[PDB]
Amino acid sequence: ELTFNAEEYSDISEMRSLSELLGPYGMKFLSESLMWHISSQVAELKKLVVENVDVLTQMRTSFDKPDQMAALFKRLSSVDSVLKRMTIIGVILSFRSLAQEALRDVLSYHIPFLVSSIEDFKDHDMKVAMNVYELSSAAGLPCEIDPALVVALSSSPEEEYKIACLLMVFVAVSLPTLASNVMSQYSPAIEGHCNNIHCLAKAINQIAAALFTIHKGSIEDRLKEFLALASSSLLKIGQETDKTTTRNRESVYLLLDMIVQESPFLTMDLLESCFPYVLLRNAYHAVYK
């Protein structure tokens, strides 16, 4: 019983019109509110990680042993909640990108001499680099690490880092469950999935970039670890024959391609070493024919 058409409020022309009216101040406020809602989702995810802390720690070191991997999985609780909440984060971040991209195009047209200086200054330390990024994101420039997300997620240092690491594990091992969902079907009309799981590419990347900046870890390494475990878990269902569990197997495989395309920390070469492109190629063929 929706009373509005979402496309008439969220497309390129509309987001550009919004940016004209709100400007950098307004769009920055809009984002801060978007980030607040991600903070709340993140806080809830950490709760689910702590609830599964034992199983998740073992899964992280038992990645090479499949018999106990499938056995540990059955001991996990609230997997559906983890996926649902990461999708919501991804959905909110997808909206922010639309907003930011529109703001960027409006400013480049209104204040080109300032935008020029900002683009140069961004393209050429770890605490000082955040000040460059906040000024950049204010002009709608895409940043590798999202400053507003870093701020919102900053609200025991060794304990926090573990939970972050184990969240990645939680998500990676959960991805194959999406293949049982009829709504996980990839659609060429969408260039994504009916249940928004394509937005997970953005959630996984940006959440990892933010959390492992706050905990001064290595984003590249943690995502590499994530991809290895994600690929491994998804390859396992490739031999499966059950019509329920494998219904949208090929559409879920496509997430790995999206994750790597979205992430500046991940390369196609690295993807090739753990998930051969011929599987993704065949998957794309299946959904497009």
Binding site for another protein (CB under 8 A): 5, 7-8, 11-14, 112-113, 116-117, 120, 123-124, 188-189, 191, 232, 235-239, 268, 274-279, 281-282, 284-286, 288-289
Chain residue at closest Cβ approach to Cl ion = 83
Position 45 contacts Cl ion (CB under 5 A)? no
Tell me whether residue 14 or residue 134 sits nearer to another protein (CB atom).
Answer: 14
From another protein, Cl ion, none, which one binds at residue 83 (CB under 5 to 8 Å depending on kind)? Cl ion
From Cl ion, another protein, none, which one binds at residue 154 (CB under 5 to 8 Å depending on kind)? none
From another protein, Cl ion, none, which one binds at residue 265 (CB under 5 to 8 Å depending on kind)? none
Q: How far is the CB of 138 from another protein (least distance, A)?
A: 20
From the list 83, 145, 203, 204, which residue makes contact with Cl ion (rule: CB under 5 A)?
Answer: 83
Helix/strand/coil (H/E/C) assignment for every residue in the chain: CCCCCCHHHHCHHHHHHHHHHHHHHHHHHHHHHHHHHHHHHHHHHHHHHHCCHHHHHHHHHCCCCHHHHHHHHCCCCCHHHHHHHHHHHHHHHHHHHHHHHHHHHHHHHHCHHHHHHHHHHHHCCCCCHHHHHHHHHHCCCCCCCCHHHHHHHCCCHHHHHHHHHHHHHHHHHHHHHHHHCHHHCEECCCCEECCCHHHHHHHHHHHHHHHHHHCCCCHHHHHHHHHHHHHHHHHHCCCCCCCCCCCCHHHHHHHHHHHHHHCCCCCHHHHHHHCCHHHHHHHHHHHHC
Q: How far is the CB of 237 from another protein (least distance, A)?
A: 8
Tell me whether residue 1 or residue 120 sits nearer to another protein (CB atom).
Answer: 120
Position 280 contacts Cl ion (CB under 5 A)? no
